[PDB]
Design a protein around this ligand. Structure first.
Ligand SMILES: Nc1ncnc2c1ncn2[C@@H]1O[C@H](COP(=O)(O)OP(=O)(O)OP(=O)(O)OP(=O)(O)OP(=O)(O)OC[C@H]2O[C@@H](n3cnc4c(N)ncnc43)[C@H](O)[C@@H]2O)[C@@H](O)[C@H]1O
Length: 188
């Protein structure tokens, strides 16, 4: 499974809170059949388990802060292994969010062939979150934004240098955004 995974198409999806990551990923799953792994969903699944670990994660995520790298990466890796036998490709949604998170993923799992940069303005994100969990109040949204611009924007730079970033314009209507997404995936 390790080797299957290292040989799979691996797509990173990066974007600010409320930018449209999950929305576009669900469209990618429906059309292309990738195995969707949301870091948020995996973390919230742990919270919902009622485990002691979940309670810890709850406290972190409700404050809008980043969970320890090893915790989220281990979750994803295990999730990839469990799906490795049946998976046609992996869609990694909301990881990496730090340059170090990308590096450790490449060390422990494999190399991305594509990064979809789901690009939107902060203002757009804020109103999208507002119009739509426990991380939803004003203060938390701001911390989430802060962290994104501080920690996660360097990830885009990293993979632009790698040469695998395709920017999609998330200010467009969802289907027009997806048309950009499709163009990038069809090219793989
Ligand atoms: N790697 C990691 N390392 C450490 N900690 C981590 C971590 N990953 C997660 N965590 C922790 O978990 C927390 C949650 O993170 P996480 O769940 O991973 O990311 P998020 O950005 O907070 O997720 P969102 O669902 O809020 O945003 P989204 O981009 O998916 O937008 P969506 O498609 O739903 O859309 C939002 C709204 O906008 C609408 N919408 C989407 N696109 C459009 C469009 N084009 N036009 C109009 N409306 C649109 C949608 O219908 C919807 O209503 C993190 O803060 C962190 O604490």
């Amino acid at each position: 499974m390790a080797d299957k995974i290292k040989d799979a198409k691996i797509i990173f999806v990066v974007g600010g809170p409320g930018s449209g990551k999950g929305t576009q990923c669900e469209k990618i799953v429906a059309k292309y059949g990738y195995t969707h792994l949301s870091s948020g969903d995996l973390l919230r699944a742990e919270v919902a388990s009622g485990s002691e670990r979940g309670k810890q994660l709850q406290a972190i995520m409700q404050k809008g802060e980043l969970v320890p790298l090893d915790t989220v990466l281990d979750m994803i890796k295990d999730a990839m292994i469990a799906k490795a036998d049946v998976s046609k490709g992996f869609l990694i949604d909301g990881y990496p969010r730090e340059v170090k998170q990308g590096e450790e993923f490449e060390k422990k799992i494999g190399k991305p062939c594509l990064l979809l940069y789901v690009d939107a303005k902060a203002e757009t994100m804020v109103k999208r979150l507002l119009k739509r969990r426990s991380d939803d109040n004003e203060e938390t949204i701001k911390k989430r934004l802060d962290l994104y611009y501080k920690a996660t924007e360097p990830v885009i730079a990293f993979y632009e240098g790698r040469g695998i970033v395709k920017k999609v314009d998330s200010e467009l209507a969802v289907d027009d955004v997806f048309a950009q997404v499709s163009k990038a995936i069809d090219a793989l």
